[PDB]
Design a protein around this motif. Structure first.
Motif, short mmCIF file in Angstrom:
data_model
loop_
_atom_site.label_atom_id
_atom_site.label_comp_id
_atom_site.label_asym_id
_atom_site.label_seq_id
_atom_site.Cartn_x
_atom_site.Cartn_y
_atom_site.Cartn_z
N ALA B 1 0.32 -1.31 0.15
CA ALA B 1 -0.29 -0.17 0.42
C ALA B 1 0.97 1.73 0.18
O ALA B 1 2.62 1.07 0.32
CB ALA B 1 -1.15 -0.03 0.58
N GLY B 2 0.08 2.73 0.22
CA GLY B 2 0.03 3.74 -0.26
C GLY B 2 1.53 3.98 -1.44
O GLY B 2 1.55 3.79 -2.61
N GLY B 3 2.40 4.66 -1.16
CA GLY B 3 3.67 4.37 -2.33
C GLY B 3 3.98 3.94 -2.61
O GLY B 3 3.69 3.56 -4.08
N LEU B 4 4.54 2.14 -2.17
CA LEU B 4 4.99 1.65 -2.94
C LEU B 4 4.15 0.59 -4.00
O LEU B 4 4.70 0.05 -4.76
CB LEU B 4 5.33 0.40 -1.56
CG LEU B 4 6.44 -0.75 -2.80
CD1 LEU B 4 8.21 -0.22 -2.12
CD2 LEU B 4 6.51 -2.33 -1.68
N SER B 5 2.45 0.72 -3.39
CA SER B 5 1.42 0.00 -4.79
C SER B 5 1.18 0.74 -6.57
O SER B 5 1.46 0.15 -6.90
CB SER B 5 0.29 -0.06 -3.96
OG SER B 5 -0.20 1.07 -3.67
N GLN B 6 2.08 1.82 -5.72
CA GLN B 6 2.15 2.98 -7.49
C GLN B 6 3.22 2.50 -8.00
O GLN B 6 2.90 2.22 -9.16
CB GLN B 6 1.72 4.25 -6.91
CG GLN B 6 1.62 4.85 -8.05
CD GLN B 6 1.65 6.78 -7.78
OE1 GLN B 6 0.82 7.11 -6.63
NE2 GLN B 6 2.84 7.56 -7.97
N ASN C 320 -7.02 0.29 -4.92
CA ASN C 320 -7.70 -0.79 -4.85
C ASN C 320 -7.90 -0.82 -3.37
O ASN C 320 -7.69 -2.33 -2.71
CB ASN C 320 -6.85 -1.89 -5.18
CG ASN C 320 -5.87 -1.53 -6.48
OD1 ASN C 320 -6.93 -1.13 -7.82
ND2 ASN C 320 -4.90 -2.11 -6.75
N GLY C 321 -8.63 0.01 -2.88
CA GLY C 321 -9.34 -0.14 -1.35
C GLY C 321 -8.76 -0.58 -0.03
O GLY C 321 -8.71 0.03 0.75
N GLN C 322 -6.38 0.36 -0.22
CA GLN C 322 -6.29 0.78 0.19
C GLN C 322 -5.93 2.17 0.45
O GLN C 322 -5.52 2.88 -1.00
CB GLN C 322 -4.63 -0.36 -0.19
CG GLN C 322 -5.39 -1.67 0.39
CD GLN C 322 -3.86 -2.81 -0.32
OE1 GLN C 322 -2.91 -1.93 0.48
NE2 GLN C 322 -3.87 -3.93 -0.46
N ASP C 323 -5.38 2.85 0.95
CA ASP C 323 -5.04 4.68 1.71
C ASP C 323 -3.96 4.98 0.47
O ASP C 323 -2.62 3.71 0.82
CB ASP C 323 -4.75 4.51 3.00
CG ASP C 323 -6.60 4.91 3.52
OD1 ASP C 323 -7.51 4.13 3.34
OD2 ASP C 323 -6.02 4.73 4.55
N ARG C 324 -4.04 5.09 -0.17
CA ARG C 324 -2.62 6.30 -1.13
C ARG C 324 -1.38 6.84 -0.64
O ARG C 324 -0.62 7.28 -0.63
CB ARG C 324 -3.04 6.56 -2.69
CG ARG C 324 -1.81 6.70 -3.00
CD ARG C 324 -1.07 7.05 -3.83
NE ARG C 324 0.12 6.67 -4.15
CZ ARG C 324 1.45 7.84 -4.14
NH1 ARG C 324 1.06 7.73 -2.85
NH2 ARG C 324 1.92 8.52 -4.60
N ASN C 375 -8.65 0.36 -9.20
CA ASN C 375 -9.97 0.84 -7.91
C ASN C 375 -9.50 2.16 -8.17
O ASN C 375 -8.49 1.59 -7.73
CB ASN C 375 -10.53 0.16 -7.39
CG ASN C 375 -12.14 0.89 -6.56
OD1 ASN C 375 -11.49 1.65 -6.22
ND2 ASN C 375 -12.66 0.20 -6.70
N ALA C 376 -9.53 3.65 -8.88
CA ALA C 376 -8.99 4.63 -7.87
C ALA C 376 -10.36 5.90 -7.47
O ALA C 376 -11.07 5.59 -8.15
CB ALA C 376 -8.26 5.57 -8.31
N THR C 377 -10.32 6.14 -6.31
CA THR C 377 -11.51 6.47 -5.14
C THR C 377 -10.71 7.70 -4.21
O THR C 377 -9.92 7.39 -3.49
CB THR C 377 -11.84 4.89 -3.98
OG1 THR C 377 -12.53 4.40 -4.94
CG2 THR C 377 -13.23 5.83 -3.28
#
Ligand SMILES: *[C@@H]1O[C@H](CO)[C@@H](O[C@@H]2OC[C@@H](O)[C@H](O)[C@H]2O)[C@H](O[C@@H]2O[C@@H](C)[C@@H](O[C@@H]3OC[C@@H](O[C@H]4O[C@@H](C)[C@H](O)[C@@H](O)[C@H]4O[C@@H]4O[C@@H](C)[C@H](O)[C@@H](OC)[C@H]4OC)[C@H](O)[C@H]3O)[C@@H](O[C@H]3O[C@H](C)[C@@H](O)[C@H](O[C@H]4O[C@H](CO)[C@@H](O)[C@H](O)[C@@H]4O)[C@@H]3O)[C@@H]2O[C@H]2O[C@H](CO)[C@H](O)[C@H](O)[C@H]2O)[C@H]1O
Ligand SMILES: *[C@@H]1O[C@H](CO)[C@@H](O[C@@H]2OC[C@@H](O)[C@H](O)[C@H]2O)[C@H](O[C@@H]2O[C@@H](C)[C@@H](O[C@@H]3OC[C@@H](O[C@H]4O[C@@H](C)[C@H](O)[C@@H](O)[C@H]4O[C@@H]4O[C@@H](C)[C@H](O)[C@@H](OC)[C@H]4OC)[C@H](O)[C@H]3O)[C@@H](O[C@H]3O[C@H](C)[C@@H](O)[C@H](O[C@H]4O[C@H](CO)[C@@H](O)[C@H](O)[C@@H]4O)[C@@H]3O)[C@@H]2O[C@H]2O[C@H](CO)[C@H](O)[C@H](O)[C@H]2O)[C@H]1O
Ligand SMILES: *[C@@H]1O[C@H](CO)[C@@H](O[C@@H]2OC[C@@H](O)[C@H](O)[C@H]2O)[C@H](O[C@@H]2O[C@@H](C)[C@@H](O[C@@H]3OC[C@@H](O[C@H]4O[C@@H](C)[C@H](O)[C@@H](O)[C@H]4O[C@@H]4O[C@@H](C)[C@H](O)[C@@H](OC)[C@H]4OC)[C@H](O)[C@H]3O)[C@@H](O[C@H]3O[C@H](C)[C@@H](O)[C@H](O[C@H]4O[C@H](CO)[C@@H](O)[C@H](O)[C@@H]4O)[C@@H]3O)[C@@H]2O[C@H]2O[C@H](CO)[C@H](O)[C@H](O)[C@H]2O)[C@H]1O
Ligand SMILES: *[C@@H]1O[C@H](CO)[C@@H](O[C@@H]2OC[C@@H](O)[C@H](O)[C@H]2O)[C@H](O[C@@H]2O[C@@H](C)[C@@H](O[C@@H]3OC[C@@H](O[C@H]4O[C@@H](C)[C@H](O)[C@@H](O)[C@H]4O[C@@H]4O[C@@H](C)[C@H](O)[C@@H](OC)[C@H]4OC)[C@H](O)[C@H]3O)[C@@H](O[C@H]3O[C@H](C)[C@@H](O)[C@H](O[C@H]4O[C@H](CO)[C@@H](O)[C@H](O)[C@@H]4O)[C@@H]3O)[C@@H]2O[C@H]2O[C@H](CO)[C@H](O)[C@H](O)[C@H]2O)[C@H]1O
Ligand SMILES: *[C@@H]1O[C@H](CO)[C@@H](O[C@@H]2OC[C@@H](O)[C@H](O)[C@H]2O)[C@H](O[C@@H]2O[C@@H](C)[C@@H](O[C@@H]3OC[C@@H](O)[C@H](O)[C@H]3O)[C@@H](O[C@H]3O[C@H](C)[C@@H](O)[C@H](O[C@H]4O[C@H](CO)[C@@H](O)[C@H](O)[C@@H]4O)[C@@H]3O)[C@@H]2O[C@H]2O[C@H](CO)[C@H](O)[C@H](O)[C@H]2O)[C@H]1O
Ligand SMILES: *[C@@H]1O[C@H](CO)[C@@H](O[C@@H]2OC[C@@H](O)[C@H](O)[C@H]2O)[C@H](O[C@@H]2O[C@@H](C)[C@@H](O[C@@H]3OC[C@@H](O)[C@H](O)[C@H]3O)[C@@H](O[C@H]3O[C@H](C)[C@@H](O)[C@H](O[C@H]4O[C@H](CO)[C@@H](O)[C@H](O)[C@@H]4O)[C@@H]3O)[C@@H]2O[C@H]2O[C@H](CO)[C@H](O)[C@H](O)[C@H]2O)[C@H]1O
Ligand SMILES: *[C@@H]1O[C@H](CO)[C@@H](O[C@@H]2OC[C@@H](O)[C@H](O)[C@H]2O)[C@H](O[C@@H]2O[C@@H](C)[C@@H](O[C@@H]3OC[C@@H](O)[C@H](O)[C@H]3O)[C@@H](O[C@H]3O[C@H](C)[C@@H](O)[C@H](O[C@H]4O[C@H](CO)[C@@H](O)[C@H](O)[C@@H]4O)[C@@H]3O)[C@@H]2O[C@H]2O[C@H](CO)[C@H](O)[C@H](O)[C@H]2O)[C@H]1O
Ligand SMILES: *[C@@H]1O[C@H](CO)[C@@H](O)[C@H](O[C@@H]2O[C@@H](C)[C@@H](O)[C@@H](O)[C@@H]2O)[C@H]1O
Ligand SMILES: *[C@@H]1O[C@H](CO)[C@@H](O)[C@H](O[C@@H]2O[C@@H](C)[C@@H](O)[C@@H](O)[C@@H]2O)[C@H]1O
Ligand code: HG
Ligand code: HG
Ligand code: HG
Ligand code: HG
Ligand code: HG
Ligand code: HG
Lengths: 436, 436, 436
Positions: B1-6, C320-324, C375-377
């Motif tokens: 998540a967060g930065g790493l998921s981008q 994808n349901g996780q906090d960016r 998914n982007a929200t």
């Protein structure tokens, strides 16, 4: 005709401009860069958040590099319009950057004020006050969130981003000292404001997440960073006279190749008061009315551009007893030096002398090595503070070398120097190349 | 998540952006430069300093290169608030740069006004007025030091610093002509102000001291400098009519590859009056009151952005009798041309047509060679000056092609052209490559 | 002494700065470029110019490249001071760029408003309002020419100049939709202004004329351009409550590597109303007087910097349901994000989240590939709109998470995304590399 007829107007003088072209303005090739992502992540604050308290933060190791850092404050007004002057900035009295127990840099609230007066400008400078003050005529009880951006070396350019991934065995910590009394928040002059709320604090650090290729390079390779530091010495201003021009020599205890010197004369009673209070609009409480008093400032309008209210008449620097340059008026260091090297506008009472062509740029462009100078002295001559500060006719109609008699309150002299240093990072540890 | 998921969200479209990186934003390598030092050193002024007097200065040979040059004036007001308009700028009526007896460039006070209206902006432009005017509502008798920065080629960028060390056999001189009458200082309108003090003048030149390696190179090697010059031709504006649209063709006598053209229509009685006086706030003495008179301006607020008060309706340029471009309204040359190529804001009455993509940049970016054009003509059509200037309802509510009847006072037409040239320096002497 | 004594002060620390110099600041070598000429040439407009009408233009093939494009409007006021708010900007309701029948980009009037609030600043931003509004307190019947500059990829930098010479078999067209109702021109609120004049329209394109060498290269060689596009999705704001904090999740339907997101909450009744109307100076018609009404804005002063009048309390993005990233207050996206990456000032009600270090720069500096995200929200939490908008004491003295009760009128939510794409041009035809 039209455009095409100008192309045919070609001569021998065009050889210096367009003969055998090297570049074209109509086909830019953009550079490809390393993939990355940014995330602003909240930090843990150790210690009790309150006026006059010291708190600290150890940066968590979520990402590979860190860049911007912002301190969030929530405050409540205790007064009406124009009774605050950068309260969030003053609240962050000083902030220390430490790597592996070693101090890298340390800033102060008055440096934030001086930096803002010199190196911020235009809409950016107004947006900064929006982040640190009430600018919409808010009344008693208004509550607002403030954002104080840190301005250490890795905060000012991503090219100096601090590599946490390369500092495995060294922790990076920030030490904050919160101010005890903030005008218009919990204190009105010297009287405390009853029921004033304690501040709430939050610290946010922007992390860079690197791709595998660059991640491995940062972790395994040694690194050298050309970074900047702040040097500060607080002196007592010589008492200016209403009958003679006082003078003063201050020995400068600075080190390292230094980009510039910056100094101000401030009244410690009022945050940012760099000039004398007077009975002209914006220079004292109730100026131009029956309630005018030059003992208290118009807090919301503490700054001014009126050189008449500045106390410094002339100044020069000496190197080993010899003039580094010929004496110039105080307005030269306030107007011309910023004009020649910054390109903004600086309020009166803030002075600059630059050794660099571009002191606001990170790329070095000229320094003086104060580590190789045994004696450096700032020679000062003050105006004759003989003007009746209560008389607008006297303040708005006087000569160059006199100022308002309230200039005797400008007792604190703060001299700043911005120098370069080298931060070497290897084997999971960071260290400055030069201590002095 | 967060930065790493981008970072993991990588696709084929990222190949154009980050595929095989060439640069990184997080590891800037700064350039090492030649060691140097700067010193501002006062010059000797030959001749009597006074209104209407000509004085000169031969630059002393203290350092290796020279860059910025500032003229210091000390003046005393003769009027109250808003009775001066750039007095220090007007006082420097014209300044000539001469190398080895040869004129390199020459500027005028009206060029300083036009340059400020076009190429300065934001806080820098306000700081410039602080250096050349009273901006704090000062009254009669206020005395202030002013700083007029010269804007010749070597004053505007250190990359064109004039090498005195390479001009052993050629002296570098500046010739100043001081104005005789300055509004709000020694003259109020056409009436002299009794007891007005003569000005005091000081000239300061910033020197560069070079290290031995670069010093020897500058002294022994031949040098070529791509420099800029100013060309000026003063013409008489055709009398605009209140019943018809007057027109006029001005033959342009310019030479060299020229970056841009800039022109204004001014009333010689009032410094910087580029627009018609009218009975709207800031456009005439006592505007909006019983003492309003459109014969005298609000001196402190001589400029305006109101296109309605500008006299030029339309204009185009012709090359050998053919349209260089289709006719555009005067507001196009005042708003769009600065918007497209400068990015600031220009007051009404000042017009630009740029041949360059970036006319304010030193790096050449497009010119027209006026030396290869036999006939160049500026075709002008003026608005019908039929609006009652004494009526705010008429001035603030009218159409595009009409203006105030006081526009007939805009009798002087000043056209400026900024061109390039080559300054060759060898064997201790300097010389321009092209005379015309 | 003086400058020379500082040169001798040399030490080991100077090795990192001046040891073995690579560059010098005092001898700039300027680049020679390809010869060219610029001509602004008027286009033909197909269709009837009028309120609510659609018109189009096929760019004529006069030159080799095209850069800037400006739409000229002539309008007549129907009201007095402060009754218009960017009328020329609103009039250009949307503009579509099409190459060979294929849409390349499309902009909207609200995007022009949002772009101006985010990426223009200082005198440039004020000059832009001069080009699109009355800024001189003009009255009923005032007629002025306006200039709306287009901001497509080839309009913003000459390095992306569209090569018409390489698009032999593809026409380049612009499709304009003119607004039907414009406040202060032909409509006052919802009441039409009798006798209001139809607008007159003119389209001007700046052409580049290239020399033979570069002309042949552009016509024969294949070209790839890294260009930017605009993505827009208009959503309905969830009704904010005066008793609870409403929340809302908006699924983001975006594609391509995206530089940044920008969004606002606007009231469709009033152009540019991004904040709640209130009874404080500049926030409603007749504010601070007996005729104050929070149902109608002070049109000339529709914008504000007062965060209290903004409706967004907090926001975050989810991948994808996780906090960016962790949730931040609305003021963070309005103040800090522009401060960290733009350096201007943005009025309240306009929000930014940047994936790029420099979102205003053409050179790519960090993107997120929305084409690789299922998914982007955008998660939103609104303030409690419980403040009495008619009470200045309540508006100017309240807490962080509440706003004026008139915030319920901010029903439209506009989300913008600026992405990159590749325009390939070969064999006389252009085409985008990626559709989604
Ligand atoms: C810095 O520079 C800024 C830019 O110039 C200044 O802002 C400008 O001030 C002048 C205005 O014309 C201009 O519009 C504004 O931009 C700034 O000035 C200070 O801050 C501003 C916002 C004013 O403060 C507001 O003043 C009005 C007060 O309201 C009370 O006013 C009474 C007259 C009413 O009877 C009472 O009911 C209150 O008003 C009601 O509530 C307000 C909020 C509503 O707006 C009003 O509706 C119209 C009423 O509701 C129905 C506010 O509390 C206060 O925040 C400056 O105040 C000066 O200018 C005002 C126009 C004038 O009214 C003030 O007089 C009042 O206060 C003085 C004491 O301050 C009393 O002696 C007087 O009897 C009266 O009560 C006053 O002249 C602020 O400036 C003052 O305070 C400063 C504190 O640092 C400083 O001391 C300065 O010298 C003072 O002039 C500048 O700080
Ligand atoms: C350019 O734009 C600027 C920005 O708008 C203008 O500044 C603004 O002016 C309006 C103000 O509300 C605002 O605060 C200010 O920013 C600028 O205006 C000109 O310069 C300003 C500074 C004013 O000049 C000052 O005006 C006051 C004079 O003082 C005398 O005022 C008398 C009423 C008193 O009786 C007398 O005692 C004097 O005041 C005392 O001394 C002053 C210094 C103290 O401040 C005051 O204490 C409060 C007293 O001491 C106890 C100053 O000498 C002068 O420098 C503008 O003047 C206009 O606006 C004033 C508010 C108003 O008072 C003025 O009226 C006086 O003068 C006019 C003639 O000018 C007389 O007819 C009238 O009877 C009265 O005496 C006047 O309306 C300046 O503007 C004027 O002059 C210009 C000259 O070029 C021009 O002619 C313009 O149209 C005029 O309006 C702009 O130039
Ligand atoms: C956005 O912010 C700007 C910056 O603050 C505002 O401009 C400032 O407004 C305050 C001024 O002190 C300051 O100088 C100015 O910069 C802007 O305000 C709006 O636009 C300005 C230009 C004003 O509009 C002008 O107001 C005067 C009108 O003239 C009539 O005034 C009557 C009093 C006269 O009796 C009549 O004869 C008219 O004047 C004559 O003609 C004018 C053109 C000449 O200048 C005048 O000579 C001196 C006379 O000729 C001899 C103009 O038509 C109009 O364009 C603001 O109006 C407010 O402030 C004025 C100073 C005040 O006079 C106004 O009161 C009049 O109008 C109101 C209704 O609007 C009536 O109720 C009242 O009875 C009176 O008739 C008014 O208080 C503008 O603001 C108003 O309208 C806005 C529309 O969107 C909005 O509704 C706002 O809340 C209103 O305050 C800001 O928009
Ligand atoms: C925007 O901000 C401004 C400040 O920045 C606000 O103004 C401040 O309001 C408080 C004042 O103390 C302060 O001076 C002022 O600056 C503004 O509020 C609104 O505008 C002001 C001007 C008030 O309007 C006036 O209200 C009184 C009316 O007169 C009637 O009063 C009755 C008590 C009498 O019985 C009746 O006969 C009327 O009086 C007569 O007629 C008037 C025209 C004569 O002048 C008077 O001569 C003596 C009488 O002649 C016979 C006026 O017509 C009207 O202009 C605000 O009103 C509030 O404050 C008043 C002091 C108070 O009296 C009002 O109560 C009256 O009206 C309410 C309904 O509004 C009734 O329910 C009540 O019974 C009473 O009649 C009221 O509290 C205005 O605010 C009100 O309306 C706003 C919308 O317009 C808004 O809805 C707001 O919440 C309301 O409070 C701000 O808009
Ligand atoms: C700088 O600061 C000093 C100290 O505050 C201030 O001097 C103070 O001024 C007020 C006075 O009460 C104090 O004693 C003094 O310390 C100085 O002001 C200016 O210099 C002084 C010496 C006065 O000049 C003298 O005026 C009287 C005159 O006979 C004599 O020749 C002259 O040297 C100031 O003049 C003011 O105060 C006088 C007491 C008063 O009489 C003056 O009024 C006369 O002159 C004014 C115009 O100046 C006429 O309108 C009036 O009708 C009458 O003839 C005057 O109020 C002097 O200030 C005045 O002049 C200066 C420029 O010299 C500025 O324009 C001021 O705005 C203006 O008030 C400060 O400059
Ligand atoms: C541009 O400049 C010119 C020259 O200065 C100016 O015309 C001058 O206006 C003043 C007048 O005394 C001079 O003779 C004239 O040269 C022009 O103003 C506008 O055009 C002129 C022709 C007038 O229009 C005429 O008004 C009378 C009406 O019967 C006729 O149909 C109409 O064409 C100006 O109108 C003003 O002056 C008249 C003498 C006066 O009667 C008008 O009052 C009427 O109309 C106003 C509203 O416009 C009503 O409020 C009032 O009750 C009455 O019905 C009016 O004062 C006209 O200016 C007026 O209209 C223009 C837009 O057309 C602007 O809004 C002005 O602000 C407004 O004054 C300048 O545009
Ligand atoms: C945010 O918005 C809300 C909603 O608009 C607003 O509350 C509205 O205020 C007006 C009132 O008529 C409505 O019922 C209410 O919804 C809020 O204002 C502030 O909070 C409310 C609860 C009031 O506080 C209460 O005041 C009375 C007191 O006994 C009680 O202990 C206190 O909680 C607002 O106070 C104002 O309105 C009262 C009705 C009035 O009696 C108050 O006057 C008293 O206090 C003032 C100083 O605050 C004295 O000068 C006066 O002599 C008397 O003692 C007062 O007008 C309260 O607003 C007031 O205080 C806040 C900060 O708490 C701000 O400074 C306001 O500018 C100020 O008016 C908004 O904050
Ligand atoms: C500055 O000089 C002024 C003119 O002499 C004095 O008024 C002022 O003194 C202060 O204010 C006056 C009114 C008295 O109360 C003094 O006691 C006070 O020190 C000087 O500060
Ligand atoms: C916002 O809240 C205000 C305080 O309760 C109301 O005054 C306002 O209501 C509007 O204006 C009032 C005066 C009434 O006319 C209402 O009908 C109207 O909706 C709220 O918008
Ligand atoms: Hg030094
Ligand atoms: Hg003193
Ligand atoms: Hg030409
Ligand atoms: Hg005329
Ligand atoms: Hg994303
Ligand atoms: Hg609500």
């Amino acid at each position: 005709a039209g455009g095409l007829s100008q192309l045919v107007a070609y001569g021998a003088q065009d050889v210096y401009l367009t003969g055998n072209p090297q570049i074209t303005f109509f086909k830019t090739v953009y550079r490809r860069y390393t993939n990355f992502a940014i995330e602003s992540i909240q930090q843990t604050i150790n210690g009790s958040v309150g006026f006059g308290n010291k708190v600290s933060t150890q940066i968590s190791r979520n990402g590979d590099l860190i860049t911007d850092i912002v301190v969030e404050f929530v405050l409540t007004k205790g007064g009406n319009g124009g009774t605050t002057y950068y309260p969030a900035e003053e609240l962050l009295q000083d902030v220390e950057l430490e790597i592996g127990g070693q101090r890298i840099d340390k800033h102060y609230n008055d440096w934030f004020r001086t930096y803002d007066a010199l190196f911020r400008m235009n809409d950016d400078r107004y947006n900064y006050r929006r982040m640190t003050d009430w600018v919409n005529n808010e009344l008693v009880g208004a509550q607002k969130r403030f954002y104080v951006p840190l301005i250490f070396f890795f905060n000012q350019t991503p090219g100096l981003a601090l590599p946490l991934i390369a500092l495995q065995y060294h922790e990076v910590k920030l030490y904050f000292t919160l101010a005890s009394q903030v005008q218009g928040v919990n204190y009105n002059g010297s009287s405390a404001i009853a029921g004033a709320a304690q501040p709430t604090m939050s610290v946010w650090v922007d992390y860079i997440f690197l791709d595998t290729q660059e991640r491995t390079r940062f972790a395994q390779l040694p690194h050298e960073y050309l970074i900047e530091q702040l040097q500060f010495t607080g002196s007592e201003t010589a008492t200016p006279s209403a009958t003679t021009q006082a003078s003063q020599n201050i020995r400068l205890n600075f080190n390292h190749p230094t980009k510039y010197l910056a100094w101000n004369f401030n009244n410690p009673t009022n945050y940012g008061q760099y000039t004398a209070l007077a009975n002209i609009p914006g220079a004292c409480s109730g100026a131009g009315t029956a309630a005018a008093t030059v003992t208290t400032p118009d807090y919301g309008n503490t700054g001014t551009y009126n050189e008449q209210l500045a106390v410094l008449d002339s100044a020069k620097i000496q190197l080993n007893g010899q003039d580094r340059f010929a004496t110039r008026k105080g307005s030269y260091f306030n107007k011309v030096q910023p004009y020649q090297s910054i390109g903004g506008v600086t309020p009166a009472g803030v002075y600059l002398y630059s050794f660099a062509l571009k002191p606001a740029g990170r790329q070095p462009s000229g320094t003086c090595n104060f580590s190789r100078i045994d004696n450096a002295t700032l020679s000062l001559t003050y105006k004759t503070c003989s003007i009746d500060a209560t008389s607008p006719a006297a303040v708005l109609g006087n000569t160059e070398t006199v100022t308002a008699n309230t200039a005797t309150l400008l007792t604190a002299l703060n001299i700043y120097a911005k120098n370069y240093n080298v931060l070497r990072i290897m084997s999971g540890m960071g260290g400055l190349a030069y201590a002095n």
